[PDB]
């Protein structure tokens, strides 16, 4: 199966002179990808962006990889020749799944290889204002991600890599004082050649506090209902291009409009759990 363009909506929560401080919590895409990489590393996989918890010099790691490729392939590529070698580039990609997904900048002595990752994430932000008491009390974080069909052609992305990404979105964060729990994961795949996208759904999510709570005092997953009604509406408009969907929801979340979402997706929906 060819790689299709995708949109991702991902929610997870994190728990446990000025005072009375509040604001919008932010999580870099680099941090999210670090959770995913550490998870695959702990699964024994070969990963490019890895530590020893001391980081490794990238130029040294590339020199080792090039010398290994040269002695196995019977070549003597220089770093400049290695940069231009489609064979060495494909050999690196076959070996490092995180490069196939997220790309990499791989310096060498007086050269460098650059892979632009098909899978890209926004910065994550809290869908509500969080309280600071210097640590955040509670934060429901939302991420938008994409999978680029065109970029996947240049990194050798495999269909099995995307299934591994889906499973890591469920398992990596809990595996890697602050408890962090995935709560919602939706990946929408688009038909080949379809030009439009749902895009970023995070602003269409609506949090509805339970009685006694407000949007400024959310402290636990039980304090609010996640209303998906507008998310279902936004997806329905693009139904003419939707090829498939993957969806996971945590059992402790209370949803409104989850039935609307699954009904829109229909037979395109595959579940994850």
Same domain, 96 and 205: no
Residue 26, beta-bridge partner list? 125
- For residue 1, being part of any structural domain is answered with no
Helix (H) or strand (E) holding 36: helix 29-42
- For residue 164, being part of any structural domain is answered with yes
Same domain, 94 and 228: no
Same domain, 232 and 144: yes
Residue with tokens 């002595």, as numbered in its chain? 109
- For residue 49, being part of any structural domain is answered with no
- For residue 15, being part of any structural domain is answered with yes
SS3 14: strand
Q: How far apart are CA 224 and CA 211, in angstroms?
A: 9
Same domain, 110 and 177: no
Output the CA–CA distances (angstroms, integers) from residue 153 to 82, 90, 115, 202, in the order listed. 20, 11, 11, 28
Q: How far apart are CA 114 and CA 231, in angstroms?
A: 36
Contacts with 147 (C-beta within 8 Å, 6 or more apart), sequence order: 3, 4, 5, 6, 8, 118, 119, 162, 187, 189
Instruction: Answer for the pair 126, 11: CB distance below 8 angstroms, yes or no.
Output: no
| Distance spanning both ends of the chain, measured CA to CA | 23
CA angle 145, 149, 155 (to 5 degrees): 95
CB atoms within 10 A of CB 81: 14
Rounded to the nearest 10°, the torsion over CA 149, 241, 123, 12 is -120
Structure-block tokens of residue 13: 């929560």
Count of residues making up the chain: 273
Instruction: Answer for the pair 238, 197: CB distance below 8 angstroms, yes or no.
Output: yes
The domain boundary, picked from 97, 115, 133, lies at 115
The tally of domains found in the chain comes to: 2
Same domain, 100 and 226: no
- For residue 12, being part of any structural domain is answered with yes
Going by C-alpha positions, the residue among 176, 163, 190, 178 that lies closest to residue 248 is: 163
SS3 227: strand
* Boundaries of domain holding 107: 58-115
Q: Which technique was the structure solved with, according to the deposited record? A: X-ray
CB atoms within 10 A of CB 20: 7
SS3 218: coil
Same domain, 124 and 108: no
CB atoms within 10 A of CB 90: 12
The domain boundary, picked from 88, 115, 142, lies at 115
Instruction: Answer for the pair 130, 136: CB distance below 8 angstroms, yes or no.
Output: yes
Burial 23-35 (b: 16+ CB within 10 A, else e): eebebebeebbbb
Same domain, 262 and 142: yes
- For residue 53, being part of any structural domain is answered with no
Structure-block tokens of residue 201: 């759904």
């Amino acid at each position: 199966m060819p790689i299709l363009d995708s949109d991702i909506l991902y929610l997870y929560d994190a728990k446990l002179r000025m005072d009375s401080v509040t604001g919008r919590n932010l999580v870099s895409d680099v941090r999210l990808k670090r959770y995913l990489r550490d998870y695959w590393l702990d699964d024994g996989q070969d990963i490019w962006v890895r530590k020893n918890g001391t980081t490794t010099d990238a130029k040294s790691r590339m020199s080792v990889l090039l010398e290994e490729y040269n002695r196995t392939s019977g070549q003597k590529l220089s770093t400049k020749e290695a940069r231009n070698s489609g064979e060495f580039r494909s050999w690196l990609l076959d070996r490092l799944m995180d490069v196939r997904l997220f790309g990499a900048t791989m310096p060498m002595e007086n050269s460098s290889i650059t892979f632009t990752g098909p899978v890209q994430f926004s910065w994550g932000y809290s869908l509500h204002r969080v309280e600071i008491n210097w640590r955040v009390l509670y934060s429901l974080i939302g991420f938008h991600g994409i999978v680029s069909r065109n970029r996947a052609r240049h990194t050798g992305l495999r269909e099995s890599d995307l299934e591994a990404l889906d499973r890591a979105m469920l398992e990596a964060i809990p595996t890697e004082k602050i408890g962090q729990i995935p709560r919602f994961y939706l990946r929408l795949e688009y038909s080949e050649g379809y030009p439009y996208r749902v895009g970023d759904l995070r602003e269409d999510v609506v949090l509805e506090p339970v009685q006694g709570k407000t949007l400024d005092t959310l402290r636990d997953v039980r304090d609010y209902v996640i209303n998906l009604e507008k998310v279902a509406d936004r997806i329905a408009v693009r139904l003419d291009g939707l090829a498939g969907a993957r969806l996971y929801v945590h059992p402790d979340v209370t949803f409104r409009g989850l039935d609307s979402l699954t009904g829109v997706l229909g037979d395109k929906l595959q579940t994850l759990s």
